[PDB]
């Protein structure tokens, strides 16, 4: 029933099902690995909660940005582009559903 979440980063795609937290970050073992030094090892958590996908800033040093606003969380209803590390840091494209 819950839609899957596709994450597009720098020519890569990964697709996740609701039920376990997804890690975005610099860690070699991250589900979505982003190597730029602005990025913390476990920079974001992605998860399906209360009926929607969310991207959560996991107490990162350099943060999560939506349209030049630094935010602790981004709600992903259908489609969304965010930046991590800076307003012009690595971009993540989110897409909900198949």
Descriptive overview:
- There is one protein chain.
- The protein has a six-stranded antiparallel beta sheet with strand order 2-1-11-10-7-8, with no helix packed on it. Strands 4-3-5-6-9 form a five-stranded mixed beta sheet, with no helix packed on it.
- It has one domain (1-98).
- The protein is built from no helices and eleven strands.
- It is an all-beta fold and 98 residues long.
- The chain has strands at 5-9, 12-16, 22-25, 32-33, 44-49, 52-57, 64-66, 69-70, 73-76, 79-84, 91-96.
- A hairpin with a 2-residue loop joins strand 5 and strand 6.
In sequence order, what are the helices and strands, one letter per element? EEEEEEEEEEE
* Strand content range: over 45%
- Class by SSE composition: mainly beta
- Sheet with the most strands: spatial strand order: 2-1-11-10-7-8
| Number of individual domains | 1
Overall number of strands: 11
Largest sheet: 6 strands, antiparallel
Distance between the termini: 12 Å
Rounded radius of gyration (Å): 12 Å
Please give the share of residues in helix.
under 10%
Number of helices: 0
So what's the overall shape?
globular
Protein name: ABC transporter ATP-binding/permease protein Rv1747
Function: Involved in the translocation of an unknown substrate across the membrane. Transmembrane domains (TMD) form a pore in the membrane and the ATP-binding domain (NBD) is responsible for energy generation. Required for virulence.
Organism: Mycobacterium tuberculosis (strain ATCC 25618 / H37Rv)
Subcellular location: Cell membrane
Give the helices and strands, then pairings:
Elements: E1 5-9, E2 12-16, E3 22-25, E4 32-33, E5 44-49, E6 52-57, E7 64-66, E8 69-70, E9 73-76, E10 79-84, E11 91-96
Parallel strand pairs: 3-4
Antiparallel strand pairs: 1-2, 1-11, 3-5, 5-6, 6-9, 7-8, 7-10, 10-11
